[PDB]
Design an enzyme around this catalytic site. Structure first.
Site, PDB file in Angstrom:
ATOM      1  N   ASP A 264      -1.448   5.095   6.133  1.00 27.89           N
ATOM      2  CA  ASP A 264      -1.625   3.651   6.265  1.00 27.89           C
ATOM      3  C   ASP A 264      -0.943   2.845   5.168  1.00 27.89           C
ATOM      4  O   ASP A 264      -1.500   2.683   4.081  1.00 27.89           O
ATOM      5  CB  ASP A 264      -3.127   3.374   6.234  1.00 27.89           C
ATOM      6  CG  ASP A 264      -3.491   1.974   6.660  1.00 27.89           C
ATOM      7  OD1 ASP A 264      -2.670   1.043   6.530  1.00 27.89           O
ATOM      8  OD2 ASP A 264      -4.637   1.813   7.123  1.00 27.89           O
ATOM      9  N   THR A 265       0.241   2.314   5.459  1.00 30.62           N
ATOM     10  CA  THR A 265       0.990   1.527   4.477  1.00 30.62           C
ATOM     11  C   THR A 265       0.320   0.192   4.153  1.00 30.62           C
ATOM     12  O   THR A 265       0.665  -0.461   3.169  1.00 30.62           O
ATOM     13  CB  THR A 265       2.428   1.249   4.960  1.00 30.62           C
ATOM     14  OG1 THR A 265       2.397   0.542   6.212  1.00 30.62           O
ATOM     15  CG2 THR A 265       3.179   2.551   5.137  1.00 30.62           C
ATOM     16  N   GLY A 266      -0.637  -0.212   4.983  1.00 27.59           N
ATOM     17  CA  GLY A 266      -1.326  -1.464   4.739  1.00 27.59           C
ATOM     18  C   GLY A 266      -2.492  -1.317   3.770  1.00 27.59           C
ATOM     19  O   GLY A 266      -2.963  -2.299   3.209  1.00 27.59           O
TER      20      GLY A 266
HETATM   21  C1  LIG Z   1      -8.208  -3.220  -0.973  1.00 25.40           C
HETATM   22  N1  LIG Z   1      -8.438  -2.686   0.353  1.00 25.40           N
HETATM   23  C2  LIG Z   1      -7.867  -1.465   0.654  1.00 25.40           C
HETATM   24  O1  LIG Z   1      -7.165  -0.845  -0.186  1.00 25.40           O
HETATM   25  C3  LIG Z   1      -8.096  -0.850   1.997  1.00 25.40           C
HETATM   26  C4  LIG Z   1      -8.247   0.579   2.122  1.00 25.40           C
HETATM   27  C5  LIG Z   1      -8.443   1.168   3.399  1.00 25.40           C
HETATM   28  C6  LIG Z   1      -8.485   0.332   4.549  1.00 25.40           C
HETATM   29  C7  LIG Z   1      -8.338  -1.089   4.424  1.00 25.40           C
HETATM   30  C8  LIG Z   1      -8.362  -1.915   5.645  1.00 25.40           C
HETATM   31  N2  LIG Z   1      -7.628  -1.807   6.829  1.00 25.40           N
HETATM   32  C9  LIG Z   1      -6.281  -2.381   6.661  1.00 25.40           C
HETATM   33  C10 LIG Z   1      -6.222  -3.892   7.016  1.00 25.40           C
HETATM   34  O2  LIG Z   1      -7.036  -4.602   6.043  1.00 25.40           O
HETATM   35  C11 LIG Z   1      -6.508  -5.188   4.917  1.00 25.40           C
HETATM   36  C12 LIG Z   1      -7.145  -6.343   4.369  1.00 25.40           C
HETATM   37  C13 LIG Z   1      -6.633  -6.975   3.189  1.00 25.40           C
HETATM   38  C14 LIG Z   1      -5.472  -6.456   2.553  1.00 25.40           C
HETATM   39  C15 LIG Z   1      -4.815  -5.307   3.086  1.00 25.40           C
HETATM   40  C16 LIG Z   1      -5.330  -4.677   4.257  1.00 25.40           C
HETATM   41  C17 LIG Z   1      -5.365  -1.341   7.329  1.00 25.40           C
HETATM   42  O3  LIG Z   1      -4.096  -1.311   6.688  1.00 25.40           O
HETATM   43  C18 LIG Z   1      -5.111  -1.517   8.822  1.00 25.40           C
HETATM   44  O4  LIG Z   1      -4.400  -0.373   9.246  1.00 25.40           O
HETATM   45  C19 LIG Z   1      -6.366  -1.710   9.689  1.00 25.40           C
HETATM   46  C20 LIG Z   1      -6.086  -1.467  11.176  1.00 25.40           C
HETATM   47  O5  LIG Z   1      -5.969  -2.719  11.895  1.00 25.40           O
HETATM   48  C21 LIG Z   1      -5.698  -2.708  13.257  1.00 25.40           C
HETATM   49  C22 LIG Z   1      -4.971  -3.790  13.851  1.00 25.40           C
HETATM   50  C23 LIG Z   1      -4.685  -3.800  15.253  1.00 25.40           C
HETATM   51  C24 LIG Z   1      -5.123  -2.719  16.079  1.00 25.40           C
HETATM   52  C25 LIG Z   1      -5.848  -1.626  15.509  1.00 25.40           C
HETATM   53  C26 LIG Z   1      -6.133  -1.625  14.107  1.00 25.40           C
HETATM   54  N3  LIG Z   1      -7.536  -0.939   9.207  1.00 25.40           N
HETATM   55  C27 LIG Z   1      -7.584   0.564   9.160  1.00 25.40           C
HETATM   56  C28 LIG Z   1      -8.138   1.344  10.329  1.00 25.40           C
HETATM   57  C29 LIG Z   1      -7.256   2.075  11.199  1.00 25.40           C
HETATM   58  C30 LIG Z   1      -7.772   2.810  12.312  1.00 25.40           C
HETATM   59  C31 LIG Z   1      -9.186   2.816  12.561  1.00 25.40           C
HETATM   60  C32 LIG Z   1     -10.072   2.090  11.695  1.00 25.40           C
HETATM   61  C33 LIG Z   1      -9.544   1.358  10.582  1.00 25.40           C
HETATM   62  S1  LIG Z   1      -8.536  -1.779   8.210  1.00 25.40           S
HETATM   63  O6  LIG Z   1      -9.713  -0.942   7.981  1.00 25.40           O
HETATM   64  O7  LIG Z   1      -8.755  -3.125   8.737  1.00 25.40           O
HETATM   65  C34 LIG Z   1      -8.143  -1.674   3.152  1.00 25.40           C
END
Ligand SMILES: CNC(=O)c1cccc(CN2[C@H](COc3ccccc3)[C@H](O)[C@@H](O)[C@@H](COc3ccccc3)N(Cc3ccccc3)S2(=O)=O)c1
Lengths: 99, 99
Positions: B25-27
């Site tokens: 997860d690059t996000g």
């Molecule tokens: C500091 N927080 C972390 O380090 C930190 C550490 C771990 C996780 C997170 C949060 N996640 C981010 C998004 O949240 C943020 C919020 C603020 C800043 C950056 C990211 C992630 O990158 C996304 O991939 C989405 C998938 O969003 C979508 C969108 C469309 C369709 C389907 C999904 N999720 C992860 C996820 C994936 C699969 C199943 C369950 C959860 S999430 O939980 O929602 C933050």
């Protein structure tokens, strides 16, 4: 280009004639953006994150420019923490993970 | 290797001798894994995303093997529905986004 991950992979996108910042997110299946106005009819969709699920509006065939690359696909609008570019559009611009 | 995004980028990881499937997860800034036992002291923390926040336990200096590449870093443990490998570890294996 090649983007490293020492910092958040934020890029500028253009949608509806406006520039916004969005995160290149390989963990997301779809693209979800902050509340905004898009043309056409929308359909309901539920997407989940670590905290649970949220309801978003799904708009199809939306033109979105990512780093200069033009894409046309489904965009979801809802209460997301940040603008997220997901796999549905990442595949359109030929984005891959490498290591 | 080069991972395309037509499907979710799931990989096998080894932690605490246990094998598990995780999403690249690059996000995500940090790495969050499902409930499990890890040695050492931990600190409580709150992480949020789509759907809201969840309480996790933060462990530092944990050894993880991702696709054969050893990486060291902080790992968060909590009631996450899927194992997530964030940027803190992706950087250590030299993972980049390319297009
Ligand atoms: C500091 N927080 C972390 O380090 C930190 C550490 C771990 C996780 C997170 C949060 N996640 C981010 C998004 O949240 C943020 C919020 C603020 C800043 C950056 C990211 C992630 O990158 C996304 O991939 C989405 C998938 O969003 C979508 C969108 C469309 C369709 C389907 C999904 N999720 C992860 C996820 C994936 C699969 C199943 C369950 C959860 S999430 O939980 O929602 C933050």
């Amino acid at each position: 280009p090649q983007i490293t991950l020492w910092q958040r992979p934020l890029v500028t996108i253009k949608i509806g004639g406006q520039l916004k910042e969005a995160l290149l997110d390989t963990g997301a299946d779809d693209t979800v953006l902050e509340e905004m106005s898009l043309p056409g009819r929308w359909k309901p969709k539920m997407i989940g994150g670590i905290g649970g699920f949220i309801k978003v509006r799904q708009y199809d065939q939306i033109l979105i420019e990512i780093c200069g690359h033009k894409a046309i696909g489904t965009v979801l609008v809802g209460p997301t923490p940040v603008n997220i570019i997901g796999r549905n559009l990442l595949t359109q611009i030929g984005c891959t993970l490498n290591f």
